[PDB]
Design a binder for this molecule. Structure first.
Ligand code: CLA
Ligand code: CLA
Ligand code: CLA
Ligand code: CLA
Ligand code: CLA
Ligand code: CLA
Ligand code: CLA
Ligand SMILES: CCCCCCCCCCCCCCCCCC(=O)OC[C@H](CO[C@@H]1O[C@H](CO)[C@H](O)[C@H](O)[C@H]1O)OC(=O)CCCCCCCCCCCCCCCCC
Ligand SMILES: CCCCCCCCCCCCCCCC(=O)OC[C@H](COP(=O)(O)OC[C@@H](O)CO)OC(=O)CCCCCCCCCCCCCCC
Ligand SMILES: CC1=C(/C=C/C(C)=C/C=C/C(C)=C/C=C/C=C(C)/C=C/C=C(C)/C=C/C2=C(C)CCCC2(C)C)C(C)(C)CCC1
Ligand SMILES: CC1=C(C/C=C(\C)CCC[C@H](C)CCC[C@H](C)CCCC(C)C)C(=O)c2ccccc2C1=O
Ligand code: SF4
Lengths: 41, 73, 159, 143, 80, 146, 741
């Protein structure tokens, strides 16, 4: 499955995975630390 | 064939299409692109056009004044 | 599966008009040939008079029945006839300046009649011919507008 | 090779007529005639829109634009491998041989055509427009 | 008419002449101090200004250049 | 437009004694759309209605006028020369082949506007419509209250 | 035999090695990127299968398997809708009280404060009020449970897996040969008799056995939990006989031709159910039986392998006249050899069909409690109208693609296509003239009325009071269909729609459907519609007929279907391509259907939709379409400005997403104007001045940054224009009609 993992390394798939990751990280940060208007913690 | 209106351009006067009219309307004050244009004649036509602009400005102000006086309160 | 109707123009498939019933039906060709526009031997002033009478008479109706004074009993017809007179005057002006603009180059190719015989150019398509045509159009159009008013006044069944 | 005179007794392809053909321009200023010799009766596309059958032997065609004639020329040369030549015809009756002006087609050389409009400098070696300013007519530095 | 100039970077590829839909250009021998052929523009009164020639020129920068000049019936590509 | 929107709304809330409206609604663009463009358009667009007209009728008409000129400029800005030249060729054919009308012929051959001229005319319609629309709105929203 | 199954066995190896090589399908993209134009071309050419190869067999195989992929995706989407109705819905609550509970089948997660979109729709539920009509469709099918929706979702996922397997199978394992696709006679026989005939017959059976009894009990006030399940109605004939006595006789009246016995569940009532405001499902069942028989006889028309039937080639080659030369000779080859021709015809009729569906589903609401869900009704009309317009513009596009690529003048000599190309100048000249005439005598009427109303002269307007332009032909047709059960359809009990005339059907106090009165405003707006349609047709037909050649460019076919221009010469040849005619027909289809749906929204909110508070109907806007739709200022004031008060004041509500998408669609629309008003030459120079800054800091990419192609600039512009405008109208419509209706 060298070719399949080459496909997963393509720009659109890697972009989808990375932005799902970034968006999920931000979403979980905003779930556990809701409404962060200022850096106070 | 050769027309008369774009006197400042023989290439536009020889244009058989409607593009001649438009481009002679829109190249009239590009004096530098005029056929047979000297720098001195350029500056002189600019001076005269400036006098004309001033006359138009003062006429427009005269009309504003006149209408405020005649029809205004 | 014979008898196709649509033909090339005068049998020339490269001139590009495609003779057709609406074009070359003998009733249509006859009617269009009998119109004063295509009476090339008749003086352009008289063809202009006929055309102008027709057009001045017809274009008064809209101004009469649909103009701004259409709902005033005796004023509707006067106002419409005068609007039509003005439009006829404007059209005569436009005809005159068209005759001034158009007829300067004197085309050199001759004309034929879709049969082979070369005819002379219509004197209408000259400076003098078009000037007299426009004079005739003005006279006939003002006359036809006046006659439109007269018909507003004298026709029994005019509403 | 010398300039061929246009034979007007040349037949025309079988065409049922269109509306993309000649206009008053042909009657007034100029139109164009293209001639070619076909080996067999073949259906080709008219640049005016439509399908025509070129006749076996010489074929004459009228057009109102040079681009139409050269479009048909490239079609006949690329799809049929023919050798057409076209003319410019005026309502005067004057015929001006145009396309293989030298006899050969311009993509090949004939050793005897003179070069025109050849600037012997680079395109980045043109002068600035401030040097050709007030040249009478409005000009480009390429002249 | 349009001005079609040809510069001394021409390699004689003939593609400009192949691509011209108006037969404005041709290939002439040994006017450029080059290899066999150089391009010419002897019929610029038929040039419409499509710039198909300089779309087909492979040199950098273009060895064929079309400067749109005054318009006519032929330059505006009119069948009327 | 941003500059004059800002000016006009700040000064409309100042002149009405309601600066809090701008201070509370200018931080988001639905406040600009709702409390400036939509709220102040009421008297303007009611310049003429099925129940009559007032002196703001001319500004309502001019509003629609500028919108129309703007949108017409869109025609010259999006649609480009090459569609119109072919359309004009078809119309040329039609005129040359129409009886009683081929008697009249053009002296200048009809062609579509050039590319540069298209851009100029589209930008001119665009700017004239922009200007007339906003002048109508400005005068009608300021002259309607004051 | 001539009609047979013909396939290649294992034509294509199932392997991931071409996934790892983007642009394998092209010889111009297999060389890898050097510029970003490659990245865009890889997506523009992905489904242009006729530019990958040139043989029709592989093209057809790719098309077949891609259709299987599309069907699998549609099945995923349908299973998702059914699943969201089974899990994230208020459907079981909505069945018990459909007149008060807002249908909702989407719940929002409480993450960034967006749980405000989970609105109080009813049924002890918080979610997004849907406008899809799925609740009414499910009640018409007789669902009455979330378990049935869940199992329909599972079946849809199974069918999606089946479709994807079938695509893989019919491309990689056993792919049909070209002679199998060119069996258009058998394809039509099976798609008429089987796809539409057996399909309509099976749905008629479902309606006989499941929908009709379940909905007859639902309309009788029976709670959905007390209703027998569909299998209890299938097994026990006594229950069905208790509901419909004709079931006591069995299927004997069908075989004895005593079909009138089935008049209990096969009716011709016409009109609407007064309990639900939808069509009688007995009428619907009879309808589906009738068209099932009709399509099953229609699917026995074409000759496949036995002597009976028609050869479509013979029909075509026999239909010719004195005006049309050879006639339809050479069209069978066109439509059996070119996929783009088939796509043109099929998209044309499919879009016309979607628009017809839109017009027929609002006037004859086929689903229960659909007519009084004004949001569902408006959204369905708008949606299917838009889909139809898009399909029609695509029909123009692919007709042009056929003309450029697959057209051959040898097979078309003096036939209808040759003769259409041969007088295209007349066609387009008369279309131009009628477009100008319609534009004047439609929009200049609005301008005249605006000028008169502004001048203080309402007696000079084209209004129902001053200068009446009454649509007397449409009014006569209305009156004729209203009086049809009396003379010309005597076995129908009522007219097809209440829009022809009569009394209103009120369901839950709200008007389901009521007579639509046509006046001067309707005349004017219908002629506006005709105008915009004629201009869209003008653009697209001009792109089709002038796709190969013109008087401007005689060799346009060699430049291709999709090219920016020929150059700045001949005065300028920008957008001479047929692709650019599609690009402009898109703008004009948008401008047409925007007015279509605006006319629908205003006409419905003014003259149909409303409440019956006392004896007397109070419409939503108050009946102002008649007197205010005469002017542009009326459409701006009384429709756009007035009805925007619900989308701009939606902040802090469950409709706040609609205001947000309103603003964002405005933004996207205006952003389209950067791509439409501009050109590539500015952006390439800006990009190279930026590439300078990237080269300075050694971050210049190897894939050279290019500006979007001219064609791609136009495509991006029109895509963003359509998206912005349509989503603006979407938000405006939905925020308005969820509040006021
Ligand atoms: C550029 C303009 C702009 C700006 C400045 C902001 C700024 C903000 N927005 Mg707004 N927003 C914008 C545009 C903008 N937004 C747009 C366009 C939209 C519409 C799509 C929104 C819609 C929106 C909503 C709906 C919400 C916000 C919220 C917020 C806040 C986010 C706080 C947060 O997530 O803490 C995150 C805190 C961090 C420390 C994250 C930093 C990133 C990483 C983790 C730091 C690195 C740590 C470490 C080194 C990592 C190690 C490696 C790792 C892999 C393990 C903040 C005030 C939220 C809020 O509460 O506002 C008050 C909120 O609910 N915004
Ligand atoms: C057209 C197809 C379609 C669409 C647009 C949606 C859309 C949605 N689904 Mg649904 N769904 C679908 C098909 C679809 N679904 C099908 C076919 C199934 C059955 C397998 C489901 C089963 C399903 C469940 C079980 C749930 C959703 C949920 C959701 C929501 C969030 C999904 C998410 O965060 O992804 C995350 C994507 C990545 C991390 C990547 C969203 C509204 C969730 C929801 O609405 O919660 C309230 C949820 O819990 N979906
Ligand atoms: C794992 C199974 C598998 C494998 C290994 C292959 C392998 C191959 N196929 Mg086959 N194929 C399969 C399944 C498979 N296929 C199925 C299930 C179908 C039916 C649809 C097809 C239909 C098919 C056709 C019609 C063609 C191929 C082709 C190919 C070749 C390259 C395809 C490529 O570049 O893929 C990479 C491509 C993708 C990953 C795109 C997948 C797109 C999916 C189907 C749709 C997803 C849409 C998505 C929901 C949209 C979201 C939008 C977003 C904004 C949310 C290669 C030999 C092509 C070829 O030339 O073969 C020689 C060709 O023409 N295949
Ligand atoms: C009664 C027989 C029959 C039926 C029902 C269909 C039905 C269909 N065909 Mg047609 N087809 C048939 C015979 C039939 N075909 C024959 C004999 C040929 C050869 C000439 C073709 C050639 C053909 C082509 C070339 C194409 C179709 C396509 C389609 C689909 C169009 C999309 C649609 O309407 O979605 C409606 C969807 C449904 C009703 C869902 C149910 C789908 C079922 C499971 C498949 C129908 C049964 C199948 C034809 C028989 C094989 C069963 C399988 C288990 C082996 C549709 C499913 C198009 C398509 O989309 O391809 C996928 C397409 O491109 N068909
Ligand atoms: C496709 C549409 C469709 C379907 C499936 C049905 C199905 C049915 N209808 Mg309906 N019906 C329909 C359309 C349909 N109808 C239409 C259009 C009308 C209007 C004319 C009616 C009017 C109507 C009436 C008035 C009545 C029915 C009745 C029935 C039932 C009796 C069937 C019967 O006697 O026929 C005979 C059918 C068969 C003999 C086929 C059975 C073949 C089996 C499946 C073979 C499988 C054997 C297998 C090979 C081996 C076993 C497998 C394994 C265990 C090993 C049945 C549930 C009757 C009923 O009782 O309803 C409750 C009834 O009174 N129908
Ligand atoms: C049955 C429907 C159908 C089918 C099968 C095709 C098939 C085809 N079309 Mg046709 N077309 C259709 C409908 C259809 N089209 C419609 C409705 C239109 C009008 C809009 C067109 C307009 C059209 C044009 C103008 C052209 C084609 C072309 C093509 C070919 C290649 C398309 C391609 O590679 O794009 C691959 C897919 C994409 C590039 C994705 C496009 C994404 C769009 C622009 C955005 C919309 C997405 C979404 C709805 C918006 C929200 C997204 C969100 C993330 C913001 C292919 C033969 C081209 C062709 O043949 O070239 C020679 C071509 O030039 N079509
Ligand atoms: C409001 C904006 C607007 C307007 C008014 C027009 C107007 C027109 N377009 Mg354009 N267009 C536009 C936007 C607009 N377009 C945009 C944004 C696009 C997308 C790129 C297009 C794309 C486009 C294409 C592709 C086509 C058109 C066509 C047309 C014409 C069809 C209607 C017609 O002739 O009726 C008559 C004229 C009108 C309805 C315009 C309003 C005139 C009213 C009645 C007032 C009359 C004034 C009166 C004479 C007083 C004069 C005052 C005096 C002092 C001068 C017309 C010239 C088509 C065409 O030219 O072929 C027919 C065509 O093919 N347009
Ligand atoms: C052919 C074109 C005929 C159009 C005539 C028309 O539309 O009149 C339109 C006008 C309409 O007149 C308007 O009607 C409105 C209806 O609500 C108003 O209420 C008023 O009646 C009036 O303003 O009709 C007339 O007033 C004139 C009647 C005579 C018609 C002339 C026909 C001329 C002969 C044509 C064939 C040769
Ligand atoms: C709708 C009005 C169609 C008018 C009509 O009755 O045409 C009918 C006429 C009938 O032609 P034929 O009988 O030769 O056509 C035989 C058919 O089998 C098609 O080949 O069609 C034409 O002449 C060409 C289309 C003219 C289109 C003119 C538009 C005005
Ligand atoms: C919704 C849906 C679903 C489901 C669906 C279904 C469930 C369907 C079904 C269907 C069906 C269930 C069908 C059936 C059919 C049947 C038929 C179609 C029958 C027919 C019959 C006939 C035609 C007959 C004939 C005859 C007679 C009459 C007598 C004797 C002789 C003979 C046999 C000849 C799913 C999951 C997919 C998902 C998606 C959606
Ligand atoms: C704005 C504009 C551009 C410039 C637009 C650029 C070139 C496209 C930008 C698309 C995206 C932003 C670039 C994609 C880069 C990566 C794929 C994104 C991945 C990383 C992100 C997180 C940044 C044109 O090239 C153009 C051409 C012809 C007519 C009009 C226009 C036009 O209006
Ligand atoms: S001008 Fe350019 S294309 Fe033409 S021959 Fe010279 S190098 Fe080749």
């Amino acid at each position: 499955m060298k070719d399949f993992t080459t496909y997963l390394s393509t720009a659109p798939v890697i972009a989808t995975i990375w932005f799902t990751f970034t968006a999920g990280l931000l979403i979980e940060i905003n779930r556990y630390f809701p409404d962060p208007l200022v850096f106070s913690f | 064939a050769t027309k008369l209106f774009p006197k400042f351009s023989q290439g536009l006067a020889q244009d058989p299409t409607t593009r001649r009219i438009w481009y002679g309307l829109a190249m009239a004050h590009d004096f530098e692109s005029h056929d047979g244009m000297t720098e001195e004649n350029l500056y002189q036509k600019i001076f005269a056009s400036h006098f004309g602009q001033l006359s138009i400005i003062f006429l427009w102000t005269s009309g504003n004044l006149f209408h405020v006086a005649w029809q205004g309160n | 599966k014979k008898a196709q109707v649509i033909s090339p123009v005068n049998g020339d498939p490269f001139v590009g008009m495609l003779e057709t019933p609406v074009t070359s039906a003998p009733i249509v060709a006859t009617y269009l040939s009998n119109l004063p526009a295509y009476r090339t031997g008749v003086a352009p002033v008289l063809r202009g008079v006929e055309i102008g009478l027709a057009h001045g008479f017809l274009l008064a109706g809209p101004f009469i029945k649909l103009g701004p004074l259409r709902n005033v009993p005796e004023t509707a017809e006067i106002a419409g006839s005068l609007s039509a007179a003005g439009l006829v005057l404007i059209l005569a002006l436009c005809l005159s300046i068209y005759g001034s603009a158009q007829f300067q180059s004197t085309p050199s190719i001759g004309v034929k009649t879709l049969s082979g015989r070369s005819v002379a150019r219509d004197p209408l398509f000259s400076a003098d011919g078009w000037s007299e045509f426009a004079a005739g159009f003005l006279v006939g159009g003002e006359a036809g507008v006046a006659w439109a008013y007269v018909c507003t006044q004298i026709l029994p069944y005019y509403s | 090779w010398t300039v061929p005179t246009l034979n007007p007794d040349t037949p025309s392809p079988i065409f049922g007529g269109s509306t993309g053909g000649l206009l008053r321009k042909a009657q007034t200023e100029e139109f164009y005639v293209i001639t070619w010799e076909a080996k067999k009766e073949q259906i080709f596309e008219m640049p005016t829109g439509g399908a025509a059958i070129m006749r076996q032997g010489p074929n004459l065609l009228k057009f109102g634009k040079k681009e139409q004639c050269l479009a048909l020329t490239t079609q006949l040369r690329n799809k049929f491998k023919l050798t057409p030549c076209f003319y410019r015809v005026f309502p005067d009756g004057k015929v001006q041989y145009l396309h293989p002006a030298d006899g050969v087609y311009p993509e090949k050389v004939n050793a005897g055509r003179v070069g025109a409009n050849q600037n012997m400098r680079r395109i980045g070696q043109n002068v600035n427009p401030i040097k050709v300013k007030f040249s009478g007519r409005m000009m480009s530095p390429a002249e | 008419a349009h001005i079609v100039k040809i510069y001394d970077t021409c390699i004689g590829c003939t593609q400009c002449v192949r691509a011209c839909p108006l037969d404005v250009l041709e290939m002439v021998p040994w006017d450029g101090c080059k290899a066999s052929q150089m391009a010419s523009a002897p019929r610029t009164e038929d040039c419409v200004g499509c710039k198909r020639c300089e779309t087909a020129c492979p040199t950098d920068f273009l060895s064929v250049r079309v400067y749109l000049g005054s318009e006519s019936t032929r330059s505006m590509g009119l069948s009327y | 437009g941003w500059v004059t929107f800002y000016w006009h709304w700040k000064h409309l809330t100042l002149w009405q004694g309601n600066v809090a409206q701008f201070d509370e609604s200018s931080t988001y663009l639905m406040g600009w759309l709702r409390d400036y463009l939509w709220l102040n358009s009421s008297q303007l667009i009611n310049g003429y209605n099925p129940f009559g007209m007032n002196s703001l009728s001319v500004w309502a008409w001019t509003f629609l006028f500028g919108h129309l000129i703007y949108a017409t400029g869109f025609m010259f800005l999006i649609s480009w020369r090459g569609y119109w030249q072919e359309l004009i060729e078809t119309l040329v054919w039609a005129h040359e082949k129409t009886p009683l009308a081929n008697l009249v012929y053009w002296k200048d051959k009809p062609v579509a506007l050039s590319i540069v001229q298209a851009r100029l005319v589209g930008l001119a319609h665009f700017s004239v419509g922009y200007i007339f629309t906003y002048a109508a709105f400005l005068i009608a929203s300021t002259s309607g209250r004051f | 035999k001539k009609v047979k199954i013909a396939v290649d066995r294992n034509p294509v190896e199932t392997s991931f090695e071409k996934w790892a090589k983007p642009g394998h399908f092209s010889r111009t993209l297999s060389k890898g990127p050097n510029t970003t134009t490659w990245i865009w071309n890889l997506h523009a050419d992905a489904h242009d299968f006729d530019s990958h190869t040139s043989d029709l067999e592989e093209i057809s195989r790719k098309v077949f398997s891609a259709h299987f992929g599309q069907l699998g995706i549609i099945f995923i989407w349908l299973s998702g809708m059914y699943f969201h109705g089974a899990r994230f819905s208020n459907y079981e609550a909505w069945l018990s009280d459909p007149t008060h509970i807002k249908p909702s089948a989407q719940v929002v997660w409480p993450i960034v404060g967006q749980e405000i979109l989970n609105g109080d729709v009813g049924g002890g539920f918080q979610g997004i009020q849907i406008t899809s009509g799925f609740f009414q469709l499910w009640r018409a099918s007789g669902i009455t449970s979330e378990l049935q929706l869940y199992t329909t979702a599972i079946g849809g996922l199974v069918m999606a897996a089946a479709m994807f397997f079938a695509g893989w199978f019919h491309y990689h394992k056993a792919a049909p040969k070209l002679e199998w696709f060119q069996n258009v006679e058998s394809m039509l026989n099976h798609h008429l008799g089987g796809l539409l005939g057996l399909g309509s017959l099976a749905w008629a059976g479902h309606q006989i056995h499941v929908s009709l009894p379940v909905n007859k009990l639902l309309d009788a006030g029976v709670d959905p939990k007390e209703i027998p399940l569909p299998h209890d109605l299938l097994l026990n004939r006594a229950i069905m006989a208790d509901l419909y006595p004709s079931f006591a006789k069995g299927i004997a009246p069908f075989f004895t031709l005593n079909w009138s016995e089935y008049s209990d569940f096969l009716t011709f009532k016409g009109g609407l159910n007064p309990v639900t405001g939808g069509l009688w499902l007995s009428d619907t069942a009879h309808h589906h039986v009738a068209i099932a028989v009709l399509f099953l006889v229609a699917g026995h028309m074409y000759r496949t392998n036995w002597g009976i039937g028609h050869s479509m080639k013979e029909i075509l080659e026999a239909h010719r006249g004195p005006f049309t030369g050879e006639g339809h000779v050479g069209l069978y080859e066109i439509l059996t050899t070119s996929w783009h021709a088939q796509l043109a015809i099929n998209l044309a009729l499919f879009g016309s069909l979607s628009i017809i569906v839109a017009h027929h589903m609002y006037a004859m609401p086929p689903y229960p409690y659909l007519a009084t869900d004004y949001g569902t009704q408006l959204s369905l009309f708008t949606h299917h109208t838009w889909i139809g317009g898009f399909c029609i513009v695509g029909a123009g596009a692919h007709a042009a693609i056929f003309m450029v690529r697959d057209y051959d003048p040898t097979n078309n000599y003096n036939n209808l296509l040759d003769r259409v190309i041969r007088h295209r100048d007349a066609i387009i000249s008369h279309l131009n003239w009628v477009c100008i005439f319609l534009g004047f005598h439609s929009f200049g009427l609005y301008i005249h009325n605006d000028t008169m109303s502004a001048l203080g002269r309402p007696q000079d307007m084209f209004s129902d009071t001053a200068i009446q332009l009454q649509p007397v032909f449409a009014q006569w047709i209305q009156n004729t269909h209203f009086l049809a059960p009396q003379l010309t359809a005597p076995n129908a009990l009522a007219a097809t729609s209440l829009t022809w005339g009569g009394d209103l059907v009120a369901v839950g106090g709200k008007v389901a459907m009521m007579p639509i009165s046509l006046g001067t405003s309707d005349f004017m707006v219908h002629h506006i519609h005709a105008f915009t349609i004629h201009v869209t047709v003008l653009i697209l037909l001009k792109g089709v007929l002038f796709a190969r050649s013109s008087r401007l460019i005689p060799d346009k076919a060699n430049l291709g279907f999709r090219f920016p221009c020929d150059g700045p010469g001949r005065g300028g040849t920008c957008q001479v391509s047929a692709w650019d005619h599609v690009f402009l027909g898109l703008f004009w289809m948008y401008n047409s259907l925007s007015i279509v749906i605006f006319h629908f929204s205003w006409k419905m909110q003014s003259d149909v939709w409303g409440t019956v508070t006392a004896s007397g109907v109070s419409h939503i806007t108050g009946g102002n379409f008649a007197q205010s739709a005469n002017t542009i200022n009326g459409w701006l004031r009384d429709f756009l400005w007035a009805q925007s008060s619900q989308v701009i004041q939606s902040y802090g509500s469950a409709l706040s997403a609609y205001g947000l998408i309103f603003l964002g669609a405005h933004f996207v629309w205006a952003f389209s104007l950067m791509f439409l008003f501009s050109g590539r030459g500015y952006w390439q120079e800006l990009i190279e001045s930026i590439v300078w800054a990237h080269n300075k800091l050694k971050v210049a990419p190897a894939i050279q940054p290019r500006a979007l192609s001219i064609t791609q600039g136009r495509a991006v512009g029109v895509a963003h224009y359509l998206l912005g405008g349509i989503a603006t109208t979407w938000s405006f419509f939905l925020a308005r009609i969820i509040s006021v209706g």
